[PDB]
Amino acid sequence: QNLNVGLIGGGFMGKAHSLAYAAMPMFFWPAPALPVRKVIAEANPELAAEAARRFGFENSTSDWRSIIDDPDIHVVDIATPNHLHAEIAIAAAEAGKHIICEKPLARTGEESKAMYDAVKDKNIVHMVAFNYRRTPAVALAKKYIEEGAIGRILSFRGTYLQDWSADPNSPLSWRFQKSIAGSGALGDIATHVIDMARYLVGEFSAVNAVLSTWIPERPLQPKGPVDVDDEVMTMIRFANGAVGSVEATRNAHGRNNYITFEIHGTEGSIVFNYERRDELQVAFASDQADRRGFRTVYTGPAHPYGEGLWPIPALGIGYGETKIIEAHDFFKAIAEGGSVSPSFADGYQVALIDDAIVESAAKESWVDVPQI
Amino acid sequence: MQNLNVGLIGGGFMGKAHSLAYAAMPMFFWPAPALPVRKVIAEANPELAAEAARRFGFENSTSDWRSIIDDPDIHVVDIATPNHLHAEIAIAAAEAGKHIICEKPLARTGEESKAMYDAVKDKNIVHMVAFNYRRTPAVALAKKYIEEGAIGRILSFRGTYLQDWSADPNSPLSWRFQKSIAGSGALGDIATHVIDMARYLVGEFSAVNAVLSTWIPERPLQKGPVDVDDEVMTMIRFANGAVGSVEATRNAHGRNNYITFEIHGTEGSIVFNYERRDELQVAFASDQADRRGFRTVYTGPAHPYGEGLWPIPALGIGYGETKIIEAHDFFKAIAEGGSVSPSFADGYQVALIDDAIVESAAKESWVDVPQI
Amino acid sequence: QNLNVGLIGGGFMGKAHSLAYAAMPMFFWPAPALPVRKVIAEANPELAAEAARRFGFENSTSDWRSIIDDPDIHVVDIATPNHLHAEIAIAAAEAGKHIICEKPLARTGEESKAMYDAVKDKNIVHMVAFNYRRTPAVALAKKYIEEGAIGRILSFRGTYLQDWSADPNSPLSWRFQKSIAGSGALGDIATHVIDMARYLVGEFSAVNAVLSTWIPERPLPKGPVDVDDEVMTMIRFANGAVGSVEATRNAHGRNNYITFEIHGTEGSIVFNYERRDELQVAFASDQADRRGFRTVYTGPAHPYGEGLWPIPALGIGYGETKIIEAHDFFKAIAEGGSVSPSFADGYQVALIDDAIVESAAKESWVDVPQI
Amino acid sequence: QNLNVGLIGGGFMGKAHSLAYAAMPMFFWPAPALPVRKVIAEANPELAAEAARRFGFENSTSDWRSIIDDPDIHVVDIATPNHLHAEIAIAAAEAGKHIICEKPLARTGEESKAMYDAVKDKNIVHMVAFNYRRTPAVALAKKYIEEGAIGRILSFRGTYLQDWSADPNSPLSWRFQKSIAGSGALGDIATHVIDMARYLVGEFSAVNAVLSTWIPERPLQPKGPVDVDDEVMTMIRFANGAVGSVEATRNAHGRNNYITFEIHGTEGSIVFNYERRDELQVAFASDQADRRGFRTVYTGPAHPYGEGLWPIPALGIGYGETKIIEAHDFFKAIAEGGSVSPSFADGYQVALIDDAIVESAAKESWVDVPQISA
């Protein structure tokens, strides 16, 4: 069975998404369904037609509403900047389309809520693209935790450290503009870590945070204001009694895409570093005392999703494989008439955690995270 | 834009990696040198062939590879079969005036490989052997440092390829363990990748001195004998006067896809580990005395091929990106009427090196490597 | 010149300190002064006598006051549990003796204050034994920072993760009893990280903390743990940087994992004591195609390198940190100078700990009093 | 019991040796015996007196013969360059002293044979100072192998890679002079790896090697010739049927004290890197399939020698602890009327391997390695 995709935005995530739709059935065969790259929307006709050629779409448009109104489109895939997520998803939901939307779901908790409300009562699959939790090593961590293999979780530490804008001469873009992005590091990269904490540990009860801006204006490439955070650090109380912290920054020289976590359980520990994403480190307390420590486990056929990936460990997982697994599970949900995680429910919950972090930093005090 | 019809022969492991490369290359390298059309796939029987076409997105399928050779509208023949069919298929393709990419090793013996070289060497066709690991961005970056003189003159090279997927004696007797099909075991299957790297980064081999080992002499079928090497180690004299060694094995517990090198130059060193392929390690002698050592460099836009890959370092290179780069350079050679490296000339030189290694092991002496 | 040492405590730190006194001049020659292991005190005569023979002291005693009252003694070295730090240090200061005291300085801010007040108007050398800041790699980090090589510091992350007590059957030693220890992970190990932060970044302005006890009772029949197993705190530095420190006794796979990561405007530095020979430094100024963390092995080219091993990676262990400590302590004494960290630093750390405890109790930011 | 030590030479090993004697009882208590730093010899009386003060020796001399002839000296510790090991050890053995000698035992197999022949019938403890095998990680690897925990050994790889002389302006010290040193990288650093190979895998059956000199002259401490190898690589056939190789060099930028090995067994693998000596990496085939790989094990109380070292893993092993452990075992053998490994027998076997490597390199052929009993 074919599912006709309408992809809105042909930039960085347009590419990664197009790769996923091209490759997914090659990896996961027989596929839950066959993606058809039907129409791509971009900001003007020339951009759109060029994107269609590059990414292999059958049609282009400069008006995304023409995708919403097309009765032959089954999936709407939102790959635009954060300011258009809600308007597009809400239209798509009203037209009864399945939706994958890039993170953060929207710019604020309130805007995210409207998207969740728009889908929560329809029999459509809705997904927020936190692809990093589908790194096989992160799925392997989940497996170990659910089996009890590290016991009860005490403590979680999570980072997302980057440096692509660590230079003040690096130009202003929508990622530095509150009106567009909603927040800086918090929305752009801390949300990936937060989803990861929710996935592996559980729901957040409360946060206590500090937001920092290090580079308050950038050249327009003549300068404009950066009115978002460059860096966030937050302590966390988890609803199950665990404690933790998350730190994200755009200003860590030497750190490129350093999404990490360290989890301490009563019977073991798990460490992950996405810069070496093929590896998961796991220390089991039950190891004999003279041979006890972290094992470096390379993901392959024996680990979650391994049947759909490469025939030996360390043949190498890249960014693409994570989007491929994401597309697979999205399509599986559609084909099976089920739901997928993370959904717009997960999207909205994160946006509420973001609001709580901002409020916490403003008031310099603990803030309870409202639940869903 | 120029569209080239590909006939792929084999829909196994490399059939998948190759299909991914043909679907993805234009998305990464845009504007593309030419657009691959997945036109026909050949497999061992008609049911296999049709299923592989559905899986890998080929328009047509056949159980007979000759029908690809004889089809005037196929521009590219891509040989992804086991080693016993490389020569017959490439020689047919050459005679039909097709561009050819052939999986490594080029064939089972030096003499088979020579017949393939002789068939293409005086034709105006692009011919390539699929030593894709040299197109890991980290390896291309190593080449850049070297050719720039940034580590000075090369003194010594150490290369490995350590695996463990058949380290269990109950792993069965596939074609890779059968000399009549494979030609050799670890030597032809995995040492050739390291030998190609050594030729690319250091230069031509002058002599070798080797030991071949078989640790598991019989396996279950699907009982039968293993008549190839499980492991090879060889010393090398390079024609430029550097020294080195290469070691490959199927029997190193904990080693998954551990293709590595370490190069010592007069002014620096380079160390590469494919299990962490995003990284190149480089130590420059020119560093100030109190801040000298190996730098871990993560590949991205600033490094070779980076313009066609991901927007920041450590977003993550996998196996697929190496095949995408290989496909890009193959197609660029075709579009531009040039040649590509490594070619059948390279494939044949490596077959001669393997033969010299076998001779060496048998005679327990240094053997000069014949030049093509 | 000889400096006569009176060492109080013959346990773990007794052994490390005795090693430092025995080895320091072999390493740093000519030496600032020659340590004489003159008297070791222990808790009873037989322990003391055995400790003097094991550690090579001229004399033993089962009464630490015999050291204070011995006019031959130049140096009092306090290697007892935390409850005796204050009374011993104060008596030694009143006797005009140079003092090194193990961390934490005392059990609380107030007890620490008494120790500081006893030395602050004197010119004796007083030192608190935060020896991890004298790992050569950490001193290297300080050098890079002071040179401006990573620019201005924005952010600090520090850990001390251990697991020696992660098993609930691990017994109720003095480190788990508030009356003796003062606090748990916070006093015992987080203080090393706080010291490193103060050394590399600067003074703490405010803290916001959470304290956790995971294992509330232990075999002595059992008894209650009334200290923290784990602490995490956010930090505002006086200079405007931000950071955090995390320490725990409950991290399976982590043995002596005292680490930091510093983000400056022109570079980053990472250190991991479990691989203490290494310092990781990333300079923004690296050419754009060869930029990232370089792993620097400490040796002759690096701070303290003239007194250590002749090549990098010959190997620094725990003892070398203590030897360097002793070296600088004795150099201060012999020149009539002061040493860092002093009891001023020890007391400042003790104020930071009190602010951390207070912060955790009140679940709010607390300003750190300055001495 | 007190054992009087006469140390000959107060250079770099003088210091590490003096540390071992001063510290060993603090770590391993009760001690087998108490080392006494009685007399140190150096090459002139001013050096000797200065060394005695630096290293805490009671007495000094400029004539090491006065240590041999001193009836109150129990232990002779030879820490000179390679050219004096033999003359000193042979005189100490004839005088009935216990002996620890620095590696390599002597300059050649023949000279090493003389040393072994002088001790093998005497009732003395004799030791060659291959201290790196007493890194606790390496002792741990021995434990795993002897237990059968990685099965039968198929393959061994060892390196000793350094760069302290990778600048050709680094001066022509004795280490670059064949007449003093006997060989370059081979004798100075490959011998440590060869000892580990013997200890962990077994005896060598044959070798096939290449020796390289990259920098053929250096400034004198005007220039002189370097007439030793900078670099060695050798393939190995082990007597038990395992294969392997060893590589050592003075010319590897970024490598400081990179003594490593990788061992492949039928049921697991072991990897060690001295630049991170606190760690041993071990991969067990028996791990469940979804949690299988190299474990990074930090050495401490649970591991060999752990009762004498630090109370938790990763408090930190440095070079000195290896010398302490070495002195512990040496004194233990003296105190118990026993012997220790590696002895002059082992020293001589290594010198024979070196000779075979040299010969192999010159003939470009496999050379069988004689056993010390031949």
Ligand SMILES: NC(=O)C1=CN([C@@H]2O[C@H](COP(=O)(O)OP(=O)(O)OC[C@H]3O[C@@H](n4cnc5c(N)ncnc54)[C@H](O)[C@@H]3O)[C@@H](O)[C@H]2O)C=CC1
């Ligand atoms: N899951 C992940 O790992 C990542 C997610 N993201 C998210 O993906 C989304 C897109 O980010 P990037 O692709 O990096 O941004 P980008 O700036 O590379 O591309 C966004 C594209 O949106 C197009 N666009 C703008 N207005 C439009 C309109 N009215 N109609 C059609 N197209 C329009 C632009 O022309 C541009 O090409 C963002 O929400 C971002 O937060 C971004 C990077 C990674």
Ligand SMILES: NC(=O)C1=CN([C@@H]2O[C@H](COP(=O)(O)OP(=O)(O)OC[C@H]3O[C@@H](n4cnc5c(N)ncnc54)[C@H](O)[C@@H]3O)[C@@H](O)[C@H]2O)C=CC1
């Ligand atoms: N460059 C690299 O990194 C790698 C290269 N290789 C090489 O690729 C080649 C294929 O290896 P794999 O894909 O691993 O083998 P495979 O066994 O996974 O697949 C080979 C396929 O060839 C098909 N085949 C056999 N006879 C055929 C015929 N007459 N016509 C059409 N198809 C036929 C089989 O049905 C099978 O599906 C080999 O030469 C191997 O050495 C393999 C793995 C990796």
Ligand SMILES: NC(=O)C1=CN([C@@H]2O[C@H](COP(=O)(O)OP(=O)(O)OC[C@H]3O[C@@H](n4cnc5c(N)ncnc54)[C@H](O)[C@@H]3O)[C@@H](O)[C@H]2O)C=CC1
């Ligand atoms: N890296 C570092 O700087 C470390 C510092 N420490 C600190 O060192 C101090 C001692 O710790 P450890 O040596 O590990 O404890 P420990 O329990 O090993 O030894 C303490 C010794 O003090 C002795 N003692 C008790 N009362 C005494 C008295 N009245 N007179 C003489 N001796 C007495 C005990 O008999 C015991 O042998 C503590 O303040 C601790 O916080 C401990 C470990 C490491």
Ligand SMILES: NC(=O)C1=CN([C@@H]2O[C@H](COP(=O)(O)OP(=O)(O)OC[C@H]3O[C@@H](n4cnc5c(N)ncnc54)[C@H](O)[C@@H]3O)[C@@H](O)[C@H]2O)C=CC1
């Ligand atoms: N086990 C290990 O890890 C190491 C072993 N070694 C070995 O230890 C030995 C000494 O090497 P280093 O200490 O590095 O050399 P060095 O050159 O630092 O010291 C040698 C000392 O021997 C002294 N000496 C020379 N002739 C003498 C005489 N007739 N009487 C008394 N002393 C005399 C010299 O004055 C010099 O101070 C060598 O055999 C070397 O191969 C060296 C370094 C490390």
